[PDB]
Amino acid sequence: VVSGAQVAIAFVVALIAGIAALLLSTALG
Amino acid sequence: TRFPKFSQDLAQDPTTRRIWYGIATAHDFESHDGMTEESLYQKLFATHFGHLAIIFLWSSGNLFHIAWQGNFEQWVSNPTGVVPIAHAIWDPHFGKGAVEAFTPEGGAGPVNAAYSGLYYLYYTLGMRFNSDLYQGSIFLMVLATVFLIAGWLHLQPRFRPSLAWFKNAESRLNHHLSALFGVSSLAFAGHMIHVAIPAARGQRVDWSNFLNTLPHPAGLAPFFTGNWGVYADPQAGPPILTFIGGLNPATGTLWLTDIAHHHLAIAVIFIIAGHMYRTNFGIGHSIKEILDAHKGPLTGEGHRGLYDTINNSLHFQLGLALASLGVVTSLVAQHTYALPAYFYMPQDHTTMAALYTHHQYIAGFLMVGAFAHGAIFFVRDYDPKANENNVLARMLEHKEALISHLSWVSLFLGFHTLGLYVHNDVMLAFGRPEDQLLIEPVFAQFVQVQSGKIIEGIPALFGGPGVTAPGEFLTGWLGSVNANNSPIFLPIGPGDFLVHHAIALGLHTTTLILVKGALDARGSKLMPDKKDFGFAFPCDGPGRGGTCDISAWDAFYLAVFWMLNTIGWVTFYWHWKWISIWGDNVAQFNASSTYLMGWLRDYLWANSAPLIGGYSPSGGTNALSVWAWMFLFGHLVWATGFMFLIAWRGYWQELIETLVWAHERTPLANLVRWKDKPVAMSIVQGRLVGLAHFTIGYILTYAAFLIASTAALYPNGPAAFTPAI
Amino acid sequence: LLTPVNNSTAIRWFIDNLPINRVGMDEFTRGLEIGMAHGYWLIGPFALLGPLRNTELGLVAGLVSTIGLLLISTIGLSGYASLVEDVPTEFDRKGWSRLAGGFLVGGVGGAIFAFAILQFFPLVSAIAR
Amino acid sequence: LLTPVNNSTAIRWFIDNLPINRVGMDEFTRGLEIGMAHGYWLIGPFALLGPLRNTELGLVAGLVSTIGLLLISTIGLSGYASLVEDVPTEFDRKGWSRLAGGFLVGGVGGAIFAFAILQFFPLVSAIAR
Amino acid sequence: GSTPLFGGSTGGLLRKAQIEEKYLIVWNSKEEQVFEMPTGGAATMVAGTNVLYLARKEQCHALHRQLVSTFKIRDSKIYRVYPNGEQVLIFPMDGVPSEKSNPGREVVGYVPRKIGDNPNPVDVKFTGKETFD
Amino acid sequence: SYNVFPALVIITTLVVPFMAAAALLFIIERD
Amino acid sequence: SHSVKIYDTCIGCTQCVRACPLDVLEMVPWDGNKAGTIASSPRTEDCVGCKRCETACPTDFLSIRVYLGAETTRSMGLAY
Ligand code: CLA
Ligand code: CLA
Ligand SMILES: CC1=C(/C=C/C(C)=C/C=C/C(C)=C/C=C/C=C(C)/C=C/C=C(C)/C=C/C2=C(C)CCCC2(C)C)C(C)(C)CCC1
Ligand SMILES: CC1=C(/C=C/C(C)=C/C=C/C(C)=C/C=C/C=C(C)/C=C/C=C(C)/C=C/C2=C(C)CCCC2(C)C)C(C)(C)CCC1
Numbered sequence A: 001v002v003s004g005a006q007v008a009i010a011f012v013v014a015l016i017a018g019i020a021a022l023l024l025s026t027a028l029g
Numbered sequence B: 001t002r003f004p005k006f007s008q009d010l011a012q013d014p015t016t017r018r019i020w021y022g023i024a025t026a027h028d029f030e031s032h033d034g035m036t037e038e039s040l041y042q043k044l045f046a047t048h049f050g051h052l053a054i055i056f057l058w059s060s061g062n063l064f065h066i067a068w069q070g071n072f073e074q075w076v077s078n079p080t081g082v083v084p085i086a087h088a089i090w091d092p093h094f095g096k097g098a099v100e101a102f103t104p105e106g107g108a109g110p111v112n113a114a115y116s117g118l119y120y121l122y123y124t125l126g127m128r129f130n131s132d133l134y135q136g137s138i139f140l141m142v143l144a145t146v147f148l149i150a151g152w153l154h155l156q157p158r159f160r161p162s163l164a165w166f167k168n169a170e171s172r173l174n175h176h177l178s179a180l181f182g183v184s185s186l187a188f189a190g191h192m193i194h195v196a197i198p199a200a201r202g203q204r205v206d207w208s209n210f211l212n213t214l215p216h217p218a219g220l221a222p223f224f225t226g227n228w229g230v231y232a233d234p235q236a237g238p239p240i241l242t243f244i245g246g247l248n249p250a251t252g253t254l255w256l257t258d259i260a261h262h263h264l265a266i267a268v269i270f271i272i273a274g275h276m277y278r279t280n281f282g283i284g285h286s287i288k289e290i291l292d293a294h295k296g297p298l299t300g301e302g303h304r305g306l307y308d309t310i311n312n313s314l315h316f317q318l319g320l321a322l323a324s325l326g327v328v329t330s331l332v333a334q335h336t337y338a339l340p341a342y343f344y345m346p347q348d349h350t351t352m353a354a355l356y357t358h359h360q361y362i363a364g365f366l367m368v369g370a371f372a373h374g375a376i377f378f379v380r381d382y383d384p385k386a387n388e389n390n391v392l393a394r395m396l397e398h399k400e401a402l403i404s405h406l407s408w409v410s411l412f413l414g415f416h417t418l419g420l421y422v423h424n425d426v427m428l429a430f431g432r433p434e435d436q437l438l439i440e441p442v443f444a445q446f447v448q449v450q451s452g453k454i455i456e457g458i459p460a461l462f463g464g465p466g467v468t469a470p471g472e473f474l475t476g477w478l479g480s481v482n483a484n485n486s487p488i489f490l491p492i493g494p495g496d497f498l499v500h501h502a503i504a505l506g507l508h509t510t511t512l513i514l515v516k517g518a519l520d521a522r523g524s525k526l527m528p529d530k531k532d533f534g535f536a537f538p539c540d541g542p543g544r545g546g547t548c549d550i551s552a553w554d555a556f557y558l559a560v561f562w563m564l565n566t567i568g569w570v571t572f573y574w575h576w577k578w579i580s581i582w583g584d585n586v587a588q589f590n591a592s593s594t595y596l597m598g599w600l601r602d603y604l605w606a607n608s609a610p611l612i613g614g615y616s617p618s619g620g621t622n623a624l625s626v627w628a629w630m631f632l633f634g635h636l637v638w639a640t641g642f643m644f645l646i647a648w649r650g651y652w653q654e655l656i657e658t659l660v661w662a663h664e665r666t667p668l669a670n671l672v673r674w675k676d677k678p679v680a681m682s683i684v685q686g687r688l689v690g691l692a693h694f695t696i697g698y699i700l701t702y703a704a705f706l707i708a709s710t711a712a713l714y715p716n717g718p719a720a721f722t723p724a725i
Numbered sequence C, D: 001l002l003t004p005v006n007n008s009t010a011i012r013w014f015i016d017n018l019p020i021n022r023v024g025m026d027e028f029t030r031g032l033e034i035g036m037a038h039g040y041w042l043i044g045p046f047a048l049l050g051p052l053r054n055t056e057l058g059l060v061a062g063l064v065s066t067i068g069l070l071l072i073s074t075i076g077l078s079g080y081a082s083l084v085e086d087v088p089t090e091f092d093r094k095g096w097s098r099l100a101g102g103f104l105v106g107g108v109g110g111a112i113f114a115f116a117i118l119q120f121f122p123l124v125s126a127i128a129r
Numbered sequence E: 001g002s003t004p005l006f007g008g009s010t011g012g013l014l015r016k017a018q019i020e021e022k023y024l025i026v027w028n029s030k031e032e033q034v035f036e037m038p039t040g041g042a043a044t045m046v047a048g049t050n051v052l053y054l055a056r057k058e059q060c061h062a063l064h065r066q067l068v069s070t071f072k073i074r075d076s077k078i079y080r081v082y083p084n085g086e087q088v089l090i091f092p093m094d095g096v097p098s099e100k101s102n103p104g105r106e107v108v109g110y111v112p113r114k115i116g117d118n119p120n121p122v123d124v125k126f127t128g129k130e131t132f133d
Numbered sequence F: 001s002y003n004v005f006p007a008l009v010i011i012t013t014l015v016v017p018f019m020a021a022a023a024l025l026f027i028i029e030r031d
Numbered sequence G: 001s002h003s004v005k006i007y008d009t010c011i012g013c014t015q016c017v018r019a020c021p022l023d024v025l026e027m028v029p030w031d032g033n034k035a036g037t038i039a040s041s042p043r044t045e046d047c048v049g050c051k052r053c054e055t056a057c058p059t060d061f062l063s064i065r066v067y068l069g070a071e072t073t074r075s076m077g078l079a080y
């Protein structure tokens, strides 16, 4: 199963992709 | 008003047109203020990293939701008795009737079934546990972060590549062929042999044991000594590379060991192919040298100048890329049903219908866009001097011959194909169905017979595939083409004849609109200086007879209707032929597809019944209520498009001026003032918004109909077959 | 054009003394009175016609609904207030901004007050029983 | 010293458009938005980790706790506002004072709104049952 | 003159330098050379007139001590800069260095007695007058 | 095995679209 | 503002000047045609882009050309 720890891990990985997307989108503008 | 910052022309507009046009021109990087060629390619390279990252985040979201909310492990244990789940539903608008209609039997809460086929893809690749899906989801999110970092990094002033790097055509071709195609296909053959084939054998191979698990018991000793047949031999362990051919009769899908050998064989072809062009090692071909040599006596200068034409025009490159993608996307649709690769997918009829229809509509959009950027190329990038008398300029030189003959073929097809359907409809109405014009499709049956289909009155010309493909695949191929419940070369008759010519009508007519738009993009008799006005402009006014829809953009707009109509005819035909197969009603298809009332009654009217009964005052709601609602939603959006397409701007602008009067004269409301003056949408914007509503309403209606009719009346089937000898 | 709807005297006096136009008010107190008026009546359609209207928590659901409607309306008004730049005192940027703040405080307060009346109107006759 | 933390563009746009810095706002509406933000989340630690967290009046106790925290914070801010004297518009004495008033109104309101959501979140799914 | 070559630091001016006073030190250099900032870190003085804004007079006088002891630069001048923009020269006051005796200065702080002849604190009780008078 | 976070639905589909629309309003209407 | 250009094929017939509802156009003296005059567009900041001038122009392909450019309050024809 996807335990609650693994949901939390996935949001941390998603947060890092979010700041990476934030870096790219401001460098693009 | 600083938005949009890339266009001071738009930024000084005091109306609401500033907002709409800033949105619509935001990705047209060539037309922005201060754009150079070098900064354009650097911005594109990083933008492409962002688009790549979105694709991997999308795939990680699908993996996460199937792992967290789906029933993959429950489906792996019982693939026939379990409907795959896309994601859970949490909708606070749901009443009790909707919650229980979407809650599966014994289930915990409301869920959506999945029709993307992702379960069959994940299962065939060897995934068996939710932890496989979750580690895929994490890995693709990390991979998305890497591409986002790469795009950001290659915008930094030390890592921005030069314009000569982007225009190094030979090195990009060598790397994309050998590594991006070849090594990636070789790696996939590695996944199939190390992971997916043992999972089909029931042997769990993953990261924890794949270093110490031989995919073949003789491992890598037959490979280097050239004794390669050991990998195909059943007595030297389970084979990993075969050429059985055809479909596996136990599954109705492709042999996994054939899939592995396919990707290994084409990996070698692509790696070899990527050694063709001259990079920094002295050897290889110059593309400019190859093109300049190919000049014959009838075609003028031949291909001279086309290197600098293609390499300096991004719209030419994009148009070539879109056209090739569109052909390949159609080929994916045609070969996924005819030669399915995924375990338990041919048994899921809704998924096969959804996947065929998805990829043919994608292929239709890619085809239209290829011609759109071909038209943009002619207005923006085409230099007649540097392309003097080559094959490109010679197309424009006989463009009236091209358009008039394309006009002839479409009228020739359209008069007789419609005429034959109408003849048969009148025959059926008057009680004379034996007086129909039923033309046997013998040229296509000829094609099937050359591949070894046994059809009685049609000859194998060269002697059959025993003569023409005498390979190791021939027994498994012939056993799959002549078997019942086998999708390879379906039986065709006169109904198949008429709709194929209707399809050919739609292909030629859509091409005619697109080619005329691309070839009259630079000018016509009505507007000889059209290139000075660009790709997209409303008209040239009411003079010279009137000039509405004269731009090359407007030919794109007209051809989207014809593309939607053509793909509609294609996907209607696929769906009705297959639900007649799945529903044991092929004789009804063969009888009623030869006249247009049969299409209306036996296809549209009959299969709408579970859909429009998706919710009702008598029987409440069921699982089809969302498709029933979307079906009506699509009719509404499509019809709203008609308002923009029919009622043009000057009506609305005079209407808005009265509303502007009303606001300024109304107490307590005239204290509130707009910052941007309300104006009616522009002439081009009205066409685009009307096309968008038309297209979205077209797609949502058919998707609601295609899914709900298949999932209710024809959801599942065997797909096993008995091979033919 | 000069019409009887545009020109009635006690219609002009009424509009001139609505809190958006009334002389001597601060824009906060303008917004406060406007919000209190609107939030009061707005709970009525939410409480009586909302999806939980036939359950015992229908008034509470209508109250939180009204607060949601006023909060989204305030987002438009506060955003409008930040962007106007146009005119002096009441149509000042700070002027509209204080009105937006007063509107939300009064709006939520008007809904809560109307909630309390609808929830506890049996108390006005409780002396007799 | 000029650092990437000190110099990011959409980090600069975000800070510049927080209500303490956003152009065109009145200091009351600044304080109102700030209070509503803080009072909303502040009830969470009080309601879930407070001493009455396992009883049925845990949310009410966390609500009155948050109001107590905001009232004491306002005493510091309103006292700060009376004593500053320093700079024009937002750092005016009246400017900080209006922010202190807006902060308390928004803070208590944000806690009450967060209370109502935590107390009545079963209602968002009540249609299905 | 121009600022010395320095990439900036966190040890420099604060809001006091905007609202109360800051200090300006001016010196001439014949050779471009590296010196230690009193704020912390290394900077390079230009071959010309150097101007540097510092937070305290002691930081300015510390740099002047470094410019004398290490680089033999003598002619440093220190100004007190007020937030309206007024500069007041504070070092050196009369052009002659403080260590060399100069006819023209007034004696300030002189007490015409040895230190053990100061009066008792009971003598100056209930007055703001101190025993060092 | 019905795994949803309803507060994540409310935040991502109601709250941050209204706040993105407010943010986009500031972007397109400023100056 | 739209750009209104006049090309050397102008025969000086003044029909575009009479057609224009905004007085964008006028005739200046010229030597390139028998009429001795040519249309000119000094006041294109008032041009709305209606192309009535192009409709009135008799020369194969026209001697006056309107290129729709940046939109203003004047060129959008707004009374508000
Ligand atoms: C039995 C009923 C029937 C009916 C009602 C029609 C009706 C039509 N035919 Mg069809 N057709 C039929 C049977 C029928 N056809 C058969 C049995 C054949 C096989 C020979 C054709 C092959 C055919 C062709 C090749 C064409 C038509 C065309 C047409 C349309 C205009 C014909 C015309 O006379 O215009 C009045 C005549 C003219 C305007 C000029 C004369 C045109 C003739 C056909 C050209 C002769 C040149 C050359 C010898 C033959 C064509 C060259 C090459 C393609 C072989 C009209 C809708 C035309 C069309 O579809 O246009 C798009 C057309 O080009 N038909
Ligand atoms: C069902 C609706 C419909 C039909 C039949 C047509 C038909 C046609 N379109 Mg059109 N089109 C449509 C919708 C339709 N379109 C829509 C919604 C759009 C988006 C605006 C377009 C945009 C479009 C473009 C951009 C182009 C076409 C073209 C064509 C012609 C294609 C060639 C052909 O098939 O010849 C056969 C002719 C037909 C099938 C038409 C019907 C002929 C009738 C049945 C004969 C009537 C006989 C009858 C006895 C006479 C009436 C008498 C009565 C008053 C008593 C054909 C005339 C193309 C073209 O002109 O090619 C040369 C072209 O470039 N269409
Ligand atoms: C306008 C324009 C453009 C565009 C174009 C397009 C869009 C195109 C398309 C086109 C296309 C879309 C094409 C396609 C084609 C295809 C082909 C050509 C194919 C063929 C194939 C074949 C022939 C095969 C054969 C076979 C068979 C059938 C079977 C058996 C086997 C074999 C393999 C032998 C551009 C951009 C350039 C630019 C300029 C302008
Ligand atoms: C009949 C008539 C009329 C009328 C009409 C109308 C339309 C009315 C309405 C009315 C209304 C509509 C009313 C309302 C009222 C309200 C109120 C009474 C409110 C109150 C509120 C409160 C008290 C609140 C409080 C608070 C809180 C709770 C919290 C926060 C703060 C505050 C303070 C805000 C007229 C005069 C014109 C004329 C004659 C006839």
Ligand SMILES: CC1=C(/C=C/C(C)=C/C=C/C(C)=C/C=C/C=C(C)/C=C/C=C(C)/C=C/C2=C(C)CCCC2(C)C)C(C)(C)CCC1
Binding pocket: C067, C071, C104, C105, C106, C108, C109, D036, D037, D038, D040, D041, D105, D106, D107, D108, D109, D110, D112, D113
């Ligand atoms: C993830 C993320 C983020 C976020 C973070 C955070 C930290 C947030 C928070 C949030 C929050 C923290 C929120 C809150 C909200 C609040 C509210 C929603 C409130 C409301 C309130 C109310 C409605 C009130 C009312 C009232 C009353 C009741 C009484 C008195 C008066 C008044 C009116 C005040 C960002 C964007 C950065 C970025 C991206 C990512």
Ligand SMILES: CC(C)=CCC/C(C)=C/CC/C(C)=C/CC/C(C)=C/CC1=C(C)C(=O)c2ccccc2C1=O
Binding pocket: B019, B643, B644, B645, B647, B648, B649, B652, B653, B679, B680, B681, B682, B683, B685, B686, B687
């Ligand atoms: C993007 C943004 C900042 C939104 C903020 C939030 C806001 C205010 C949303 C509101 C959006 C809408 C719905 C704006 C009304 C659109 C309009 C002027 C339609 C009238 C019109 C019709 C019906 C036609 O058929 C037609 C055909 C050909 C040319 C022009 C027209 C035309 O003009």
Ligand code: SF4
Binding pocket: G004, G019, G020, G021, G022, G023, G024, G025, G046, G047, G048, G049, G050, G051, G052, G053, G054, G066
């Ligand atoms: S486009 Fe219209 S307004 Fe402009 S010059 Fe021509 S006639 Fe005059």
Ligand code: SF4
Binding pocket: G006, G009, G010, G011, G012, G013, G014, G015, G016, G017, G038, G039, G053, G056, G057, G058, G059, G062, G063, G064
């Ligand atoms: S531009 Fe045309 S209409 Fe105007 S004066 Fe010249 S010829 Fe006549």
